[PDB]
């Protein structure tokens, strides 16, 4: 099972506002390792956020459960709104073995990659001319 | 007394390692707050490095004792290096009451200045084309 999301990014919320969407849609308000680790990585999330990494390539999460894609609008997408699709999941996200693959332009990789590293073993990035 | 360093950045180093080095000028391999506080804000500022704020207005470090200016050196002039100054500064470059201004794009402003924040006190963001 594979489901997707839509959220309005910039103008519309800054893209830390952005960000912050994407993990409550993931963690449901459970104060969890999860959660904390989501937040640790904000920096270099919201970085790829303000530079539209997610318009055409999802942020991907992965749990014992269903999959989901997140993309984001940004420009007059997400001022219209028409696109957008934040509705609550069915299903706790980040169940089990987790995982997030962030899209990320291949050039910027390197510096991303390092960044999450620091963080996390569970969030990544990955070329986003590729999927998971 | 205001002292300037420029630092090789991409593609000799990527941003991150770009933000290390500067780390570690700033430190001299010392902890504390500093070190702690600028390791705590490494993506926001490798973030920054990476859209080449640095380049024309400065990462400017405040302290009790002489102001750092720092930039940074991109594309041929990293290569080559030929501008370049990483020296050992012979002071202690945020001793005391120290501050961190990074350069920022206005259009990335709202975002740094939020992320910036959760981290410290110390450590904000300006427009760089102020
Ligand atoms: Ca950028």
């Given at each position: 099972?594979?489901?997707?999301?839509?959220?309005?990014?910039?103008?519309?919320?800054?893209?830390?506002?952005?960000?912050?969407?994407?993990?409550?849609?993931?963690?449901?308000?459970?104060?969890?390792?999860?959660?904390?680790?989501?937040?640790?990585?904000?920096?270099?999330?919201?970085?790829?956020?303000?530079?539209?990494?997610?318009?055409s390539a999802p942020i991907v999460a992965t749990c014992?459960?269903?999959?989901?894609?997140?993309?984001?609008?940004?420009?007059?997408?997400?001022?219209?709104?028409?696109?957008?699709?934040e509705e609550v999941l069915g299903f706790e996200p980040?169940?089990?073995?987790?995982?997030?693959?962030?899209?990320?332009?291949?050039?910027?990789?390197?510096?991303?990659?390092?960044?999450?590293?620091?963080?996390?073993?569970?969030?990544?990035?990955?070329?986003?001319?590729?999927?998971?």
């Open positions: 099972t594979v489901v997707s999301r839509t959220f309005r990014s910039s103008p519309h919320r800054d893209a830390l506002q952005t960000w912050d969407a994407i993990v409550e849609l993931l963690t449901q308000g459970k104060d969890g390792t999860a959660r904390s680790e989501l937040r640790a990585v904000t920096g270099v999330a919201a970085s790829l956020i303000a530079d539209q990494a997610p318009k014992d459960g269903p999959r989901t894609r997140i993309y984001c609008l940004f420009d007059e997408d997400a001022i219209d709104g028409d696109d957008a699709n980040l169940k089990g073995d987790w995982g997030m693959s962030l899209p990320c332009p291949k050039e910027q990789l390197g510096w991303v990659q390092s960044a999450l590293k620091k963080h996390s073993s569970r969030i990544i990035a990955r070329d986003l001319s590729q999927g998971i």
